[PDB]
């Protein structure tokens, strides 16, 4: 598999093939890291993560 098909393009969350090159985006309550691949929580208890805290 190729790009977003191969290991989600190395994105934490959403992957879209924007000119072959992989461009990642995050869900609401997250922000894209400087690497452009990771999703960083804005505050406590962001969407999707189990609140074992």
């Amino acid at each position: 598999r190729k790009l977003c098909s191969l290991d989600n393009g190395d994105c934490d969350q959403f992957c879209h093939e924007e000119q072959n090159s992989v461009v990642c985006s995050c869900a609401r309550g997250y922000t894209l890291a400087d690497n452009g691949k990771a999703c960083i929580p804005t505050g406590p208890y962001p969407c999707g993560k189990q609140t074992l805290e």
Binding site: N8, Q13, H16, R28, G29, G48, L52
Partner: protein, 234 residues
């Protein structure tokens, strides 16, 4: 939930519960944000007046994570028909915001193209609720979850005694007596990716519960992502 496991502290924090005029829960839900809750459209004709309770795991004992919210604006899909249960989706805008905490958290709304290729191609999903533990049984006093596999659409159509529309998908087992049931209706079907859970389905209907050669039918939330996005403004 027929069979399955129970939600431990923080495992199913997106679970909402619609309670009627007599304190009793009748339907399930999904927390999308602090103002919005996702539910099935058919839950609106269950009772004339209802509210939403968050952070509940035991209907009998007051937990401490429990909080009740009043529904302000009810949004139903203007093409929902109760004869086919097509477009079985509804949005609830609450009067007051939700405080996120232990047992109380939203579930991420996915992007349409990604979810179809990434989340829908996963092996299993998770359904949760306070529904019936047996087809003929009664509502569960405890919050329960179940790992439900995605069922091939071709086999999904052949098993059903009713129409399976583009806005629906099958999930569950062929014979193994484990399924969602009445009460779980409108509840969350989430899919895990990199230890993050995304909304994929709404508990809609099934020919009884846990019957051999029958599956759980879920509202394909991905076909309504633009519709929900429009709702989350006013």
């Amino acid at each position: 939930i027929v069979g399955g496991q129970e939600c431990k502290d923080g495992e199913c924090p997106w679970q909402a519960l619609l309670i009627n005029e007599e304190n009793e829960g009748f339907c399930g839900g999904t927390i999308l944000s602090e103002f919005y809750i996702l539910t099935a459209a058919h839950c609106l004709y269950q009772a004339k007046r209802f509210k939403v309770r968050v952070g509940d795991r035991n209907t009998e004992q007051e937990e401490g994570g429990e909080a009740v919210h009043e529904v302000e604006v009810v949004i139903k899909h203007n093409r929902f028909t109760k004869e086919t249960y097509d477009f079985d989706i509804a949005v609830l805008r609450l009067k007051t915001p939700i405080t996120f905490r232990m047992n109380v958290a939203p579930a991420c709304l996915p992007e349409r193209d990604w979810a179809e290729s990434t989340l829908m191609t996963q092996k299993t999903g998770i359904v949760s609720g306070f529904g019936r533990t047996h087809e003929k049984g009664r509502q569960s006093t405890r919050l329960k979850m179940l790992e439900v596999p995605y069922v091939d659409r071709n086999s999904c159509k052949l098993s059903s005694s009713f129409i399976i529309t583009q806005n629906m998908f099958c999930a569950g087992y062929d014979t193994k007596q484990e399924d969602a049931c009445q009460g779980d209706s409108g509840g969350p079907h989430v899919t895990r990716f990199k230890d993050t859970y995304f909304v994929t389905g709404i508990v809609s209907w099934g020919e009884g519960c846990a019957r051999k050669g029958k599956y759980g039918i879920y509202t394909k939330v991905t076909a309504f992502l633009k519709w929900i996005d429009r709702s989350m403004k006013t």
